[model samples]
Target chain A: GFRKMAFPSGKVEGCMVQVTCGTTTLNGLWLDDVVYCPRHVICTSEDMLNPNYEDLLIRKSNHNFLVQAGNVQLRVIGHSMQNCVLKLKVDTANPKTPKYKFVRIQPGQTFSVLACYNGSPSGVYQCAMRPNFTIKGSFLNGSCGSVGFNIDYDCVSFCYMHHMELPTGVHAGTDLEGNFYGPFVDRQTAQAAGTDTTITVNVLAWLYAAVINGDRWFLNRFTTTLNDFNLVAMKYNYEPLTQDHVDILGPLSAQTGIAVLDMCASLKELLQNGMNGRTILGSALLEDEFTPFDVVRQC
Target chain B: GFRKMAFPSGKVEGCMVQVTCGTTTLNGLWLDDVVYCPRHVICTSEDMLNPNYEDLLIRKSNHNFLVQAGNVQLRVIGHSMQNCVLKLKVDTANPKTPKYKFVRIQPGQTFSVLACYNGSPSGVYQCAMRPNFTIKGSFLNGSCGSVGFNIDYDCVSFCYMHHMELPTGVHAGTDLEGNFYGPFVDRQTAQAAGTDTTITVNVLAWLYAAVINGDRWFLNRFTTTLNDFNLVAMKYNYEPLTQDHVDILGPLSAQTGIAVLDMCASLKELLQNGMNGRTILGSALLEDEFTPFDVVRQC
Candidate 1:
């Protein structure tokens, strides 16, 4: 089984202090309806039993009627019987620090103090206090009316202001040195216009020269292959043999020619023996052509 | 100052037992030299003069011995003894049995027993002997036996032989098959000739077909670019170009031609709208015989 309860607006009161039966006073009060009864209350006559504990209870007279509970004490050893007044000066137009007395602390009482300021250029202030007490006896020994009260002063209100301004120039206009102007205009107008403009031309004359020279060198090397030693053998008429055709027939022809000829008459030996093949082939072909024509004798 | 002296050896004798003034057959001559002595030679008969000090002296008896020097007793107990005839068996071959026994001993006489076995597994052993008259019972119990004796065993004059046979077949040979008889006239002739014959007709046929089919596709793809693009732009004919070439030039040439035409049409539109101009030439040229032709058509 489970139990449930509702506390819509929870409110409970219990005593916050442990009170003794002797002449005792409630150090703190809250809600006023709670009663407290303490067991084993310590008496003032028994204070000697524990000196450290007695000192803690006896040190609470610093603040008037305001005891700080739980290990803290408020002790007030001195008092100002005369009334004291403190005043502050600031600009009345500012809302943060409206002109009023900053603080007024009395005898047997304590108050928290803080400085307030406003955001105005000319509003700064200092605090001043005056005690309403006087001396009525001789200067040296006789004390008459009451103990003279002392007052302290502090800065209670202050104000500060700041401002900045930027430099002015032709920031974003066509008249500026590096700015661009009209995008579209008549040809005549554009030609006549006088403004700083830039033009560029890429000269590629060396590239053109290289292209022409490379083509000439390629053609020279290619034609030399066609005419030299007939390393590229002619298969039929003027057709030169391709690489594949030469690979098939060149070695076979060299082997066959070498086999049929004596060692001294082989192509390698014939070449070494000064039988230039290119010249010999040229003469043979020319001789064949010459036979078909009639030769005129020299006069 | 320092002093040194050296002597080869010396011997001294002293009596350890004293006989009373009158006793029958005093055995004073039976005492030999003392073996140990305490620091303080004084004798005390008081038991409780200092109970703590007396307790310290009494505790030393359990740990230290008070035997007179040169006094000895021996007793033998084992299967080797037959009615006081101490017989010991020395079996050099077997190591798991006792090897020696004590034969004799004399009162007030100190003697050492030593056993040496040649070609023996040497180890430590101990024994005791019973004298003829004042016989001591079996000294096998802890209090009567000598300290443990030691024996030393050493290995010497040892030799070992090993035999290994060659593996049955042609090991470590390039041939994978186990059979060594090959395509030959006879087994001995094949062995003597050592022919390295391979049967790879099937493998060669497969490789030939693969070269004709598989590599042809790769060659076609590789040579297609040279046919399609006739320009000799690279440094040498052998300079190979990869896919990066087509990716760069194909899109670039198309864009360049399109850009020129686009500018020309835009200029013509400007002229036709309102601008006056002599004439507008088309920015593109038509393909003609002079234009480069794709050589791949022949392939």
Candidate 2:
């Protein structure tokens, strides 16, 4: 007879297993000693007797045990249980003490959990998980972790100083000799330690002659000269300080001085005249300067 | 009553006087002493009574003539004598020669005239008058006259034969001073008449070296040589001459021997062949004597 059995069969003794039948029991007993036979009995424990649980089996089949024993072969009728799950609950009945489910998450899409050790704080913050399976994990517990992905300051704003270099003034045309050829020589030449003073003087003289003669080439040179002066001024904090500057200043200042003198004398005479007379006289006076010294110095 | 009339009252008898009137009822009367009235007449010698007829004056009163009679007057009226106009005609009719009227025409307008001459045929012509006041007149005598204009003709087309004096080619990036500072030797020094030959040879040598080395400047120089040749071709009449002939005869005749060889040879072969082939071929085949000898002696 087929019957239900209990574990720890040492307490039971019988020569032949009691033949008992349940309400739905089959009549024949087909047992085999083959390891993988369809009807073989596998021992739960090696120490347990092979046929020692005959009494227990008889009791189970008869439904007569300390706790009512039914057939161990319970049938799951129709389909196996689906859409149903068994879950281990965390014990949190006490507010002070809590027991949480500790799980070793396998590398799967739904196996991740994020735990905020500290509550969300104001401003911005980054949260990460510590990487497991490494010796460095102990020291990096409070640092970024890798149980799940991380969010490192999802949004941020920062500032930095921007430095810009600006170019000013004009540039001279370069020649076949790789020299900057123009009326105004470059400031590098002027500031050179062993500059040729004669060449500088000649350049200045040529520039002056060109200005007076209204030579177009010389005028181009003059523009270059002004550009050079502008570069010198920029280099010296907008204050011209160089031998070339001094040389150029002398002639230009002298001309300006003469013009100013003419202007002042004309102005004085102009004021001595009446309103209508002052008009022309004032213009005449302003037209001349004895020294453009003030003008040059101011600019 | 007639004695008081405005006429001679006294006349000497038998003084050979003459009397005259219109047709008289009484004739052969010596009326030298007669008093003339509205209807009086006298006659003596036919010569003395010569009719001095006055111009007929047609007036509202009557059509009358002041005939000079010998101090007499007559009133005459008749239909039969009305055709007789006894008045001195001055014979003022011209000889009936041809006359002409001048026709003035404006500029850019068409002027036409039909000229007819006596005993000759007539002709019609149309002419365009210039903007200026110029007289373009045509005479009936088959002659034309234009008063004020000069004509300009377009330039004639002709093939020009020229002898060009070329400067020797010079080295790349060099001056006559032998400085290697040029990509092209200065045209000024290389173009000098006496030195051109040497410069040209030196340039060719340099060019040969450059080509062997596959230098870029040599390629540039080669391009310049091509451009120079093209300029020479343009300055001559080559395009029109090319279009004028068939079978390539005329163009073939114009080619110098070396030029023909260059056209036929590969670029590499041209460089390797050098001036030797060109000089010999030019001397032997390009000479005027060779042209005549080849055509005459060989033929």
Candidate 3:
């Protein structure tokens, strides 16, 4: 079943905290003269844990909680505090050194962390760290007070390796500058992957760049191919090609050189056999413009 | 220091598999008429486990192994085999039924799996299962023998959440279609994030789309922003504004409405304090064209 979650409502301020435990509320629930809860509740979020009634549990302190994106806060009964003054602070310490403070997720999953403290259910400040990779940001009261959040996020998976490995010791992914290496002709794998795999992986990479990675270079270069590629990736889920494959398949691999053609009978065969028939483009790849060229080569 | 790797040399066929395991070889290593190993070796691959001499270990049956991208094979002495016949096969079963077959990694890390068998170091056929996530593809000769890979990969993190969480119960990511839903004035987070955050996240999401996610829509619409946005994400690591932030900030937030302005002083202030001054764009955000409009409101 889908889970529900509670989040503080930033728009509505000065809601009275309700002492009731079972009557949960979110996004500023109000009854009579008191605001039961200042958080908004949502249950339909995808790929996340269901929300809980205890998520709205207000107390003198709360620690290590989760929240979606928005204004957040800590709430408590008015007279229960030492003073009317409430404070919120943030934890700005690096998460890597002290063991990561959020839930770890696999590809195709989403999550965030919120560390609550003794504070009002309003005006809580939060920020994301730039160099942070896993965790997203922190929640706090920017005035050196005592409320904030430590939000950590997991990586979203784009594509998966079915049952393959690049030659041992080779790598893929961009440098800090976002320049991709490995499998490209520029990376060391070019010679190892040989002309065919290199050409094939390049097209695959370009498809990822244009449609998934959203790279401007690939998007501009392969503008005509993105929708088709996206369709293939999404619809077929990288099955064998069918006749539905379009003319762009040949053009996508236009960089295939005379040397490459010498190795394989056609681009279709190269792609088919390159990864041993686990090709993502599917059977339609065989019907590209090069199909006519292969027949011509037979003469 | 950069690392090196070894891969099977598919092009070089008909080389003798050696008996001595000590003198490591890769990519069809040849000494005299006998090839020491079938895998090609490459130095300077990026972000992978450093290649080791043991990686080329050959036995009558080798268990779990690692390899880079290319044709792979199992090497064994011809004389030692009871029969000259050697069989190679693949693992075509679903990986998720049990524990995943490959190494688990965080975002920014890459890895693959190769399980070796007692067979000639050539004619191995492998395939990547379409539904597989984390693992890339497998290593096996397609003749229904033994030998395959169970590669696993982690999500490549495009963006991180700083000390912030969307309101609880909200989620992000495409619903199996490449179309993103969260924080785009669409998903549940839209109403929860309200106006400013929705707009800010939309631009941020577009930046992620144009540059990282590579969605075609944002790339075309925000062509001018990708470079600068990438620059800021990389250079400042998201520090405060500087004049160098560029003019795109105002235009990027062009969707801001009169209703939004009533809440915050201007787009600049909204972005600055949206998540309590922990924005990824940095200080230059305050310098966008909207600076004049904020001042005009005072008049």
Best model per DockQ = 3
Task: Write the residue-wise lDDT of candidate 3 on A1-299 in tens digits.
Answer: 01111112121112212122222222222222222222211122231133242332243242322211134433322311111111122222112122122122221122211122222232221111111111112222111111112222222111110011133322222221222223322121223433211122223423322222122221121122334434433333332232323333344334332221221223333333333322222221221111222112111
Task: Please tell me the interface RMSD, in Å, for model 1.
Answer: 63.5
lDDT of 1 by residue, B47-132 (tens): 21322333334443321322222333211111121221112121122221223222222211111111111111111111111111
What DockQ class does candidate 3 belong to? incorrect
**DockQ metric, candidate 2:** 0.00
- Alpha-carbon RMSD of each model: 53.9, 63.9, 27.5
Q: Which ten-residue region of model 3 chain B has the weakest summed lDDT?
A: B1-10
* Regions of candidate 3 where Cα sits further than 4 Å from its true position: A1-60, A63-255, A258-299, B1-299
Summarize candidate 3's per-residue lDDT along B1-299 as a digit string, tens digits: 01011111121112222222222222221222222222112111231133332232233232222221133434322311111111111222212122222122222122111122222332221121111111122222211111222212221111111011123322222111122223322122223433211223223322321222122221221122334443443332322232332333334334331122221223333333343322222221222111222112111
Worst 10 residues of 2 chain B by lDDT: B1-10
Q: Judged by lDDT against the true structure, how good is candidate 1?
A: 0.17
Fnat measured on candidate 3: 0.00
Worst 10 residues of 1 chain A by lDDT: A290-299
- Best TM-score among the predictions, by candidate number: 3
lDDT measured at residue B129 in model 1 versus the true structure, 0 to 100: 16
TM-score of chain B of each: 0.12, 0.13, 0.19
